[PDB]
Amino acid sequence: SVVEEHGQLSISNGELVNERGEQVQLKGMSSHGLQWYGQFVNYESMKWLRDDWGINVFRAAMYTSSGGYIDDPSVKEKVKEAVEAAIDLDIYVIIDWHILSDNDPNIYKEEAKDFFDEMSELYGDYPNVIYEIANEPNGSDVTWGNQIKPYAEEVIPIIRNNDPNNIIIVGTGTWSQDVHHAADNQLADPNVMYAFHFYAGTHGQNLRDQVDYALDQGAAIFVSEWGTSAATGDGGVFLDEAQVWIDFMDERNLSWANWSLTHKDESSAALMPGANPTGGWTEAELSPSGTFVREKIRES
Ligand SMILES: *[C@H]1O[C@H](CO)[C@@H](O[C@@H]2O[C@H](CO)[C@@H](O[C@@H]3O[C@H](CO)[C@@H](O)[C@H](O)[C@H]3O)[C@H](O)[C@H]2O)[C@H](O)[C@H]1F
């Protein structure tokens, strides 16, 4: 139903819109790293998230380092499983080249180009696909102008040769927080968005103002990762500040994916230990974070 109705997504005047020009907001879940918790990524769990939580997008977090794709490329087939499930379920899907410790996206740029060529060749005639080319650039030596923008100006043409206009999300500096610099020096492709990530454990007032600054320059923003915990993924759940951010995103038409769908014993995890990897969870099988996120998406 979702993808049949909204179909081809595009950016118009800095906003995500559907094929009839109407604003659309995606809300869903990110996997944790596919190398650690891939059992939670399957048609049945995604169907349960679609039907019971109301998700309309699923993000497949394919770490590059930390035992991910560069070390063992088999995780790309789990991305394909997720994409095909999203097509069968009629929801959107984010293919996330999940850099982190490999803090400059240029480190594995050759591999990224090949990976995105493959995925855009396979899936580029489906409207479901959203490409996320560099999760979280980070470090004071990784800047928008010098590192990230040129990286994107190499990867985007590869995708565009196969898929002229599905959405591409591009990470920003300082762990996808520095939308100010990106918005002052935007990419040329008209169907690009810039990533912005937040954690409710951080006091967020200035970060909201910076997202507004970016939006005021005509830049489109996708909140492709956020958590209810601290920046580490652990250390408490901060539902007051999470709700502030939820409301802000609704006011600004910002799409989002929550981190993350796993039973790991960390506060940002959505599931408890014993949660079935194929869905069907009871209340007791959702963590404090997962219960909150499910509520947000069902409310929407
Ligand atoms: C965006 O931020 C989230 C945190 O809010 C990041 O997710 C965290 O990434 C950590 C680093 O990969 C991860 O910890 C690792 O978990 C592995 C599997 O259990 C361990 O083997 C490893 O020792 C540990 O460092 C957190 O569990 C996770 O929440 C996300 O990557 C960022 F994009």
Q: How far apart are CA 112 and CA 151, in angstroms?
A: 10
DSSP string for residues in 85-110: HHHHHT-EEEEEEE-SSS-STTTTHH
* Residue (of 64, 42, 175) closest to 115 by Cα position: 64
Three-state DSSP at 30 gives strand
189 near 169, Cβ under 8 Å?
no
C-alpha 292/C-alpha 227 separation (Å) is 11
Furthest-apart CA pair in the chain: how many Å? 48
Give the ligand 1 atom nearest the CA of 231: 5
DSSP 47: H
Structure tokens at 244: 């502030």
Nearest residue to 236 (alpha-carbon basis) of 207, 187, 202, 185 = 202
Alpha-carbon span 238 to 157, nearest angstrom: 40
Distance 32 CA to ligand 1 centre (A): 8
Give the three-class secondary structure for 126: coil
Report which ligand 1 atom has the smallest distance to the Cα of 67. Answer: 21
Q: Resolution in Å, one decimal, please.
A: 1.1
Secondary structure (3-state) at 57:
strand
Query: Could you please report the per-residue DSSP string of 215-255?
Result: HHTT--EEEEEEESS-TTS-S---HHHHHHHHHHHHHTT--
The answer to whether 232 is annotated as binding is yes
Which residues is 286 bridged to in the sheet?
A: 271
| Side-chain half-sphere exposure of 107, counting CA atoms within 13 A | 18
Rounded Cα distance, 254 and 19, in Å:
18
Pocket test of ligand 1: the residue of 177, 268, 289 to mutate, having most ligand atoms within 8 Å of its CB, is 268
Beta bridge partners of 227: 199
> What SS3 class is residue 28?
strand
Q: Whose CA is nearest to atom 3 of ligand 1?
A: 233
Residue that the structure tokens 């996708």 belong to: 222
CA angle 152, 144, 159 (to 5 degrees): 10
CA–CA separation, 234 and 255 (whole Å): 23
CA 79 from chain centre, in angstroms, equals 13
Measured CA distances, 47 to 8, 54, 174, 280 (Å): 21, 10, 34, 10
Q: How far apart are CA 268 and CA 178, in angstroms?
A: 22
List residues bridging with 223 in a β-sheet: 256
Residue-level length of the chain: 300
Which tokens belong to 207? 């970060």
Q: How far is CA 235 from the centre of its chain?
A: 22
Contact assessment for residue 42 and residue 31, using Cβ atoms and an 8 Å cutoff: no
Instruction: Please list, residue by residue across 81-116, b when 16 or more beta carbons sit within 10 angstroms of its beta carbon and e when fewer do.
Output: bbbbbbbebebbbbbbbbbbebbbbbbbbeebbebb
- The reply to whether 108 sits in an annotated binding site is no
246-249: Cβ within 8 A, 24+ apart: 246/296, 248/208, 248/211, 249/25, 249/223
Domain 1-300: give its CATH code. 3.20.20.80
78 is known to lie in a ligand binding site? no
Q: Which residues are catalytic?
A: 136, 225
Q: Cβ-count burial of 247 within 10 angstroms (0-12 exposed, 13-18 middle, 19+ buried)?
A: exposed
Residue pair 47/53 in contact (Cβ under 8 Å)? The answer is no
Phi, psi values for residue 122, rounded to 5°: -70, -45
